Amino acid sequence: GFPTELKPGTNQFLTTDDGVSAPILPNFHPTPCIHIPGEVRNLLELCQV
Amino acid sequence: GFPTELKPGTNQFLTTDDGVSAPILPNFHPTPCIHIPGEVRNLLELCQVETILEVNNVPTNATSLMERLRFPVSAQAGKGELCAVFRADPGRDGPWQSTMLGQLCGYYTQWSGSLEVTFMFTGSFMATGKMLIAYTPPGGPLPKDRATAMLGTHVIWDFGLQSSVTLVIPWISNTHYRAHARDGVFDYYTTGLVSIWYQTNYVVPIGAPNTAYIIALAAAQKNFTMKLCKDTSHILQTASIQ
Amino acid sequence: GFPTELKPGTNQFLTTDDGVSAPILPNFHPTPCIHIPGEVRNLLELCQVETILEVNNVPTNATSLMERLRFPVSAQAGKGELCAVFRADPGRDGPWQSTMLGQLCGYYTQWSGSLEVTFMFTGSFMATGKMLIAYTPPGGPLPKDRATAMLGTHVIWDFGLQSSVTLVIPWISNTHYRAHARDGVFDYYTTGLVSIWYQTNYVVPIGAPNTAYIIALAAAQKNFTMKLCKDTSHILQTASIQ
Amino acid sequence: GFPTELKPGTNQFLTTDDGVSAPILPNFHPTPCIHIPGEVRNLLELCQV
Amino acid sequence: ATAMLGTHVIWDFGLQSSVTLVIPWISNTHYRAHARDGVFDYYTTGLV
Amino acid sequence: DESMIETRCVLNSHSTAETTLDSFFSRAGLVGEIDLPLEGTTNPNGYANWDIDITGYAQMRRKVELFTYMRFDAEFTFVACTPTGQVVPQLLQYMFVPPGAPKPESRESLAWQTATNPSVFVKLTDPPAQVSVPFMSPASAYQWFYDGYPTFGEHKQEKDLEYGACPNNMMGTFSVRTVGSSKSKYALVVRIYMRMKHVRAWIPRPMRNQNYLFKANPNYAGDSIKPTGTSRNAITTL
Amino acid sequence: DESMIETRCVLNSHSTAETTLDSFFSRAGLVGEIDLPLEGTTNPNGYANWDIDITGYAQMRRKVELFTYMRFDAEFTFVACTPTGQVVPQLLQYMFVPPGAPKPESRESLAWQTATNPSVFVKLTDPPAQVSVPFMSPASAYQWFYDGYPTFGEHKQEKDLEYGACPNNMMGTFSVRTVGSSKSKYALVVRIYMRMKHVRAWIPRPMRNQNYLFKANPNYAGDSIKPTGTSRNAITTL
Amino acid sequence: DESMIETRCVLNSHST
Amino acid sequence: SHENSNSATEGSTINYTTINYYKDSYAATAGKQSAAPLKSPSAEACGYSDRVAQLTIGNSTITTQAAANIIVGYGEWPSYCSDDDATAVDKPTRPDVSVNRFYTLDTKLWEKSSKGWYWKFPDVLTETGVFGQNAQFHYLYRSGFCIHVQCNASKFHQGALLVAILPEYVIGTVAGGTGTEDSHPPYIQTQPGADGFELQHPYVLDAGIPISQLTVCPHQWINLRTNNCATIIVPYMNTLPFDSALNHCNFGLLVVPISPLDFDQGATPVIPITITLAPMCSEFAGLRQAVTQ
Amino acid sequence: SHENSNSATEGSTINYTTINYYKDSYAATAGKQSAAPLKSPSAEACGYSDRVAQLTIGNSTITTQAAANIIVGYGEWPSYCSDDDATAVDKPTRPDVSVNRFYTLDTKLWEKSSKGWYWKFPDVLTETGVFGQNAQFHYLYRSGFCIHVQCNASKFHQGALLVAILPEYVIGTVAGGTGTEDSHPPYIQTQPGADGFELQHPYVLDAGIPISQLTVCPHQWINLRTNNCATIIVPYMNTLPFDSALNHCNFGLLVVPISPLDFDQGATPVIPITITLAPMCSEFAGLRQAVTQ
Ligand SMILES: CCCCCCCCCCCCC/C=C/[C@H](O)[C@H](N)CO
Ligand SMILES: CCCCCCCCCCCCC/C=C/[C@H](O)[C@H](N)CO
Incomplete structure (x- = not known):
């Protein structure tokens, strides 16, 4: 085994942690995204309305 | 030790997780793969094979179970009589469960694409006539007459001249994919209704049988696709296998 | 910490797992490897060495245990008499367990390739005659006469002129590999039967012994291969070693 | 998380294991090594005396 | 079952009204004399 | 399709990847439950x-x-x-016992030394033990349906159970123990889950429309032969 | 082969890799069971x-x-x-004690300080402790069979136990303790499993066809000498 | 002839 | 290069991208994948019309519709075993005229209440002809098949037969009816020989598998108005290059009336179904004394 | 480069691809591996016919069949220790004519009920000749051997001997018969000298190992109809470049009748087996006073 050392913070669940997770479905491709009007990319777009 | 941090999801066993596992046998090479005919690389290859559609799923007794594969056609009064109806949903409980497309559809939540239903006439060579096989898009109920049914997608099938016709059920849906149509809210995903009507009649001369049968063979087209692999529910074993 | 996720199989100890382990001794260099003769790099090298095949595995007493390595040949009535039979299965319980090929075969589930069985005549130089050593492919039972046996793969062995012959048991199998043939369902993996028949006789003049012996030496060919390493069952120690 | 598998030997403390360990002091540089006479680099130097 | 072990044709007479069973020249000799009841049955062509 | 209706151009970018055998079969499912009461x-x-x-x-x-x-x-x-x-x-020793290897006869059996057998030592507090098992069969594929007998000879009713038994598929024993000389103080259940990776399948059969009754046996209940699908009262109605 | 029968061309792509010593011996098996009751x-x-x-x-x-x-x-x-x-x-201290190093005489012995001895501290709740052990022998190989004596001098019956004892093979003691001044509250059993990596073997002997009785000893039961294989009633029958 | 059985090459030098 | 090439998909034509952290390729993840045989293709669809222009093999000749009505099983013509695919070092015998010929088995009668029959291959030919003698004499067997099921009826008769080829047609039992007996089919049921065996429950094919999905197997219809015969070209389908012809059947030929036979009184009530079949590219190896079973 | 080259397979000719995450190469995985010596090759098979054209060594000469009947043990000729393989810094003595010569030990009689004998090397020659004197005088010893077992019989005699060379022939006991005594063989049994020791249980070779697999060791048959002698060329086989000649035996020579001696009354009942053997490339080092044991 490659020598590793667990730091503080293992087995913690940070709700805003942007981590990799095990996919429940191998090779599942979703429904292709059709063009839907109105698309929002930033909440400041809503703030400016 | 290299500084690492365990995330949520460690020591979990996801059954569909495509992960690396410790090999029980170092340097074990398997038996070389000889050429075996018939090889399948995709389940949609099985979906495209035509399988007998059990339109006549009326009889339940074991002595009359083989009668489900065919449905009768006979001489009528020439008023555009109704021969047989069935829903065009492959994953729905009913006639389509007898097909390979239906049984494979039980393993997938969402399906899309056109469907091939081939009706093979199994009467005499003297037996002649035409049938109106109408596919009703969703929204239209069961037609009360052939005049109602011909407004939908339909084929007029001279079974006397050509013994086999294929009604291509076109992919007509609001959604890009259809889930399993069910009695209730999930009837939103109905494919529609397929009904067979006597275009003229079943005409036979003296010496030919007055009743013939049609073997419906259902398949899928090359545009058929599947999504969201799931446990099948077309058959449920409630007892433990000894 | 680098985001990691433990899969199923952590904290498991797979005994055949080829993994990295923490070295108890940093910078410990071992004793330099001098040249030692005889070095083995593959167990199939041991499989190809000819070892005494105990065809005459009749006697059980310790005083007559050395008689198992040879089997008698003597003057007969000249009717194609039966000398000795044995199964051609190296991993099977019986005559082949005395061989190195048989004992190594206990450590491997599946074997493939041809087998070399060498019969060495150990009579007088005046002792002469021929033997029909027939290998029966599977399906054929024990031949009741030499006429039945000669229909299979056979050698006619003048032991008077050449003291040693080798019956090459050819790899004749439905499967690419053979598991251990067993009494029961696993007799599907039988190699067949090898039987020795008097082609003419055992002929000796006055002063030569009337009974001689043949030492069967079994081996494997260069095409012999092995698969699926397993615990041996040719010998089972049921007591603890003190 | 990157798929990993613990082997036999985790949470073991091998006393002669030459492994990496967490430093108690970030950016602590030691006292510079002055030249001290007599330096030994191998115990066989002591063996030859 | 005995007969199908020899040279045979399976003839759908409903679909094709005429079939031809080619009796192949299967003989020990290069030429056949007249087959007769007796010794000269050596020159039999066989049975159809 | 166009031989039936007038069609519009549809750019069907519908993926077929989830209908592969490596998508249909690479999902772990229960293949064995072992009780250690x-x-x-x-x-x-x-x-x-x-x-x-x-x-x-x-x-x-x-x-x-x-x-x-x-x-x-x-x-x-x-x-x-x-x-x-x-x-x-509780610590358990799984051990793959290949055909011909000694199946253990006791918890403290000498076959548990696993000098050549693949064995897994794992505690219950650990995550479930995962191992990759290669293609075992002496054949070129596993065979769920063997139309025949493994052995030669006359086949009576006493040996009719050998029908369908292809020893290219019975590839040994999975042996599980509680590692100790004394009996464990807990009741254990080991549930075996197989995920099929690198899958090749050759001959598609009709699916199973009857209730499974016996392992490695296509036997069906004769008096309980149910239809493949649900039934209808009449054919002119839904 | 072709000197026996007429043969067809067979492209035998049969692998020999699983008969190597690194395939036959690189499987962990029980070599020692230590009881701590x-x-x-x-x-x-x-x-x-x-x-x-x-x-x-x-x-x-x-x-x-x-x-x-x-x-x-x-x-x-x-x-x-x-x-x-x-x-x-329970936390244990394994410690490799090389020859000449002090074998501990107690649980709280001063040799457990392991200032130079290789030692493993591991709890039972942890997975089994795994360590790579290098080639120990002062010889160029380990020697399971030493036809001779380690020492010189006259060899009587009292020192006949030294026959076969090659000290190129007895490479020390594996010492295990429960780490504490007081006695542990659990009975412990430590099972040692050796997987042989980077294997070279030189002189193949006949296999062992008799029951093993004593460690580092080819002794066999004289009154229980059984044949190498199973027996047959007659040689003309199977 | 070859529409009936698999045939071997026979050099029929038979005079007419 | 650093990994053993010992996965189950080595030798395939599919490139797999995989994640592996071990010495063995089979330890890797399933990964990504970086006419049609299953629809019972015709000889015209497979492009094998040259071999089909006259179905004459050995010393036999059948007559039927060409190309379009010749179902090649799984789109593959029968062939001799290739050098790499074979394992047995003994060279096989290829009689090729005494074994590759049409054998006519029996004349089972189609009735209005007929349920269907099955024939196991090469069990039907184990005691018939030089093919049967080679099957008994040799341990190893390998052959394709050209099965030509013949059922002639007048143009006033009606009915259809699902003449289908089910590979490894394992026979199940009724299990005592209640399903709690674990009975096993006898030798006359598993291997009924050239006479065949009538199906007790053709709906489940005596195996718990519906006949409605039997068409995924190589098959052809004998719908009497269209055709009077079905020709299925079956290759050798097995996990092994060779197998015993006596204790393993490669496939079962299912001839089941899906649409019942029907005709008015006055026509011929004897409508027989004839099974004529030819081994193709037949190989035999492992020669010993002849054993029937 | 960054790892210690301290695995057990450094110095080998096999390239190993390995996975290592530590400083030491022995911590790595077993990995992949990126005539024939074991079949008792003849001198013709090893290509050593030039050294075999006349078996004359030192001041002795034996006569036998050449090349084909000269078994080179493990396909390796005896040689002096190479500079790298040796550890002792003292330079060895090479007498080469007074020690590399054929020594004739004894004349053990083959009987019809004979069980077999073994000879331990160089224990048989520790008290014989200049070789014996060099063995007693020097701590370190290294030599190959040319053992020529001679057993002459008439062409009316029958029988065979497995003349075999078992390296490190450790003698086991009967352990009291029941197997619960832990007895050990005495010095006259472990090292019987030039007289040898008769086998008590030749089936298990007095070590619990079957004689049927003794042929994996260097061996030759003395089947009386074919040959009257066996010549085995044994190299120095040890874990060490040198060893003591007095308390360690490199190998045991097994001469066991597999086929019993048999002849009718009137022929000579005295059929003796003569052990003639020559050390080859004999080296002695570590010189001190002579010690017998
Ligand atoms: C350390 C534990 C390793 C576990 C090893 C399990 C072996 C996996 C073999 C899977 C191959 C199929 C197993 C059996 C097939 C079927 O159930 C029947 N025998 C065929 O009807
Ligand atoms: C921290 C624990 C490390 C454990 C170290 C164990 C040392 C491994 C040495 C293995 C070498 C062989 C051991 C003994 C060989 C044989 O059993 C006999 N002595 C020879 O008959």
């Missing part, structure tokens, strides 16, 4: 010898019996637990 | 000194005694457990 007569000695056979549970068996021949490697996951669901501090 | 007289003090010898269990011993000389590195795995199978929260 404290007072029951099933495995009272703390050890169990389970012959490897995935045809004991209807879902996986029907999935693999869709095809006749099926060559694959397998990810074997063993979820050991207390049959009340507890995670007890 | 609570009331027994075997190791009542919570410590045990086990001289390293793999010839105590028949499977590994017969596998390695197929050859005479055998130079390898070893992956040593110690599966500590309660002999009822429990995984108790």
Whole structure:
């Protein structure tokens, strides 16, 4: 085994942690995204309305 | 030790997780793969094979179970009589469960694409006539007459001249994919209704049988696709296998 | 910490797992490897060495245990008499367990390739005659006469002129590999039967012994291969070693 | 998380294991090594005396 | 079952009204004399 | 399609990747449940010898019996637990026993030394033990349907159970123990889950429309032959 | 082969890789079981000194005694457990004691300070402790069969036990303790598993066809000399 | 002839 | 290069991208994948019309519709075993005229209440002709098959037969009816020989598998108005290059009336179904004394 | 480069691809591996016919069949220790004519009930000749051997001997018969000298190993109809470059009748087996006073 050392913070669940997770479905491709009007990319777009 | 941090999801066993596992046998090479005919690389290859559609799923007794594969056609009064109806949903409980497309559809939540239903006439060579096989898009109920049914997608099938016709059920849906149509809210995903009507009649001369049968063979087209692999529910074993 | 996720199989100890382990001794260099003769790099090298095949595995007493390595040949009535039979299965319980090929075969589930069985005549130089050593492919039972046996793969062995012959048991199998043939369902993996028949006789003049012996030496060919390493069952120690 | 598998030997403390360990002091540089006479680099130097 | 072990044709007479069973020249000799009841049955062509 | 209706151009970017065998079969499912009870007569000695056979549970068996021949490697996951669901501090020794290797006769059997047998030592507090199992068969594929007998000779009714038994598929025993000289203080249940990786399948059969009754056996209830699908009152109505 | 029968061309792509010594021997098997009981007289003090010898269990011993000389590195795995199978929260100190190093005389012995000895501290709740052990022997290979004596001088019956004792093979003691001044509250069993990596073997011997009785000893039961294989009633029948 | 059985090459030097 | 090439998909034509952290390729993840045989293709669809222009093999000749009505099983013509695919070092015998010929088995009568029959291959030919003698004499066997099921009826008769080829047609039992007996089919049921065996439950094919999905197997219809015969070209389908012809059947030929036979009184009530079949590319190896079973 | 080259397979000719995460190469995985010596090759098979054209060594000469009947043990000729393989810094003595010569030990009689004998090397020659004197005087010894077992019989005699060379022939006991005594063989049994020791249980070779697999060791048959002698060329086989000649035996020579001696009354009942053997490339080092044991 490659020598590793667990730091503080293992087995913690940070709700805003942007981590990799095990996919429940191998090779599942979703429904292709059709063009839907109105698309929002930033909440400041809503703030400016 | 290299500084690492365990995330949520460690020591979990996801059954569909495509992960690396410790090999029980170092340097074990398997038996070389000889050429075996018939090889399948995709389940949609099985979906495209035509399988007998059990339109006549009326009889339940074991002595009359083989009668489900065919449905009768006979001489009528020439008023555009109704021969047989069935829903065009492959994953729905009913006639389509007898097909390979239906049984494979039980393993997938969402399906899309056109469907091939081939009706093979199994009467005499003297037996002649035409049938109106109408596919009703969703929204239209069961037609009360052939005049109602011909407004939908339909084929007029001279079974006397050509013994086999294929009604291509076109992919007509609001959604890009259809889930399993069910009695209730999930009837939103109905494919529609397929009904067979006597275009003229079943005409036979003296010496030919007055009743013939049609073997419906259902398949899928090359545009058929599947999504969201799931446990099948077309058959449920409630007892433990000894 | 680098985001990691433990899969199923952590904290498991797979005994055949080829993994990295923490070295108890940093910078410990071992004793330099001098040249030692005889070095083995593959167990199939041991499989190809000819070892005494105990065809005459009749006697059980310790005083007559050395008689198992040879089997008698003597003057007969000249009717194609039966000398000795044995199964051609190296991993099977019986005559082949005395061989190195048989004992190594206990450590491997599946074997493939041809087998070399060498019969060495150990009579007088005046002792002469021929033997029909027939290998029966599977399906054929024990031949009741030499006429039945000669229909299979056979050698006619003048032991008077050449003291040693080798019956090459050819790899004749439905499967690419053979598991251990067993009494029961696993007799599907039988190699067949090898039987020795008097082609003419055992002929000796006055002063030569009337009974001689043949030492069967079994081996494997260069095409012999092995698969699926397993615990041996040719010998089972049921007591603890003190 | 990157798929990993613990082997036999985790949470073991091998006393002669030459492994990496967490430093108690970030950016602590030691006292510079002055030249001290007599330096030994191998115990066989002591063996030859 | 005995007969199908020899040279045979399976003839759908409903679909094709005429079939031809080619009796192949299967003989020990290069030429056949007249087959007769007796010794000269050596020159039999066989049975159809 | 265009031979039936007038069609519009549809750019169908619909993926077929989820209908591959490596998508249909690479999902772990229950193929064996092993009980190690404290007072029951099933495995009272703390050890169990389970012959490897995935045809004991209807879902996986029907999935693999869709095809006749099926060559694959397998990810074997063993979820050991207390049959009340507890995670007890108990250490188990799984050990793959290949055909011909000695199947253990006791918990403290000498075959547990696993000098050549592949064995897994894992505690119940650990995550389920996962191992990759390669393609075992001496054949070129596994064979869920063997139309014939393994052995030659006359086949009477007493040996009719050998019909369908292809020893290219019975590839040994999965042996599980509680590692100790004394009996464990917990009841253990080991649940075996197989995920099929690198899957090749050759001959598709009709699916299973009858209730499975026996392992490695297409036997069906004769008096309970039900139709493949649901029934209808009449054919002119839905 | 072609000197016996007419042969067809067979493209035999049959792998020989699984018959290598690194395939035959690189599978971990039981070479030592150490008991640390609570009331027994075997190791009542919570410590045990086990001289390293793999010839105590028949499977590994017969596998390695197929050859005479055998130079390898070893992956040593110690599966500590309660002999009822429990995984108790107990911390143990394994410690390799090389020849000449002080073998501990007690659980709280001063040799446990392991300032130079290789030692492993591992709890039972942890997975089994795994360590790579290099090639120890002052010789160029380990020697399961030493036809001779280690020492010179006259060899009487009192020193006949030295026959076959090659000190190129007895490479020290594996010492295990429960780390504490007080006696542990659990009975412990440590099972040692050796996986042989980087294996070279030189002189193949006849296999072991008699029951093993004593470690590092080819002794066999004289009145129980059984044949190498099974017996037959007659030679003209199967 | 070859529409009936698999045939071997026979050099029929038979005079007419 | 650093990994053993010992996965189950080595030798395939599919490139797999995989994640592996171990020495063995089978330890890797399933990964990504970086006319049609299953629809019972005709000889015209497979492009094998040259071999089909006259179905004459050995010393036999059948007559039927060409190309379009010749179902090649799984789109593959029968062939001799390739050098790499074979394992047995003994060279096989290829009689090729005494074994590759049409054998006519029996004349089972189609009735209005007929349920269907099955024939196991090469069990039907184990005791018939030089093919049967080679099957008994040799341990190893390998052959394709050209099965030509013949059922002639007048143009006033009606009915259809699902003439289908089910590979590894394992026979199940009724299990005592209740399903709690674990009965096994006898030798006359598993291997009924050239006479065949009538199906007890053709709906489940005596195996618990519906006949409605039997068409995924190589098959052809004998719908009497269209055709009077079905020709199925079956290759050798097995996990092995060779197998015993006596204790393993490669496939079962299912001839089941899906649409019942029907005709008015006055026509011929004897409508027989004839099974004529030819081994193709037949190989035999492992020669010993002849054993029937 | 960054790892210690301290694995057990450094110095070998096999390239190993390995996975290592530590400083030491022995911590790595077993990995992949990126005439024939074991079949008792003849001198013709090893290509050593030039050294065999006349078996004359030192001041002795034996006569036998050449090349084909000269078994080179493990396909390796005896040689002096190479500079790298040797550890002792003292330079060895090479007498080469007074020690490399054929020594004739004894004349053990083959009987019809004979069980077999073994000879331990160089224990048989520790008290014989200049070789014996060099063995007593020097701590370190290294030599190959040319053992020529001679057993002459008439062409009316029958029988065979497995003349075999078992390296490190450790003698086991009967352990009291029941197997619960842990007895050890005495010095006259472990090292019987030039007289040899008769086997008590030749089936298990007095070590619990079957004689049926003794042929994996260097061996030759003395089947009386074919040959009257066996010549085995044994190299120095040890874990060490040198060893003591007095308390360690490199190998045991097994001469066991597999086929019993048999002849009718009137022929000579005295059929003796003569052990003639020559050390080859004999080296002695570590010189001190002579010690017998
Ligand atoms: C350390 C534990 C390793 C576990 C090894 C399990 C072996 C996996 C073999 C899977 C191959 C199929 C097993 C059996 C097939 C079927 O159930 C029947 N025998 C065929 O009807
Ligand atoms: C921290 C624990 C490290 C454990 C170290 C164990 C040392 C491994 C040495 C293995 C070499 C062989 C051991 C003994 C060989 C045989 O059993 C006999 N002595 C020879 O008959």
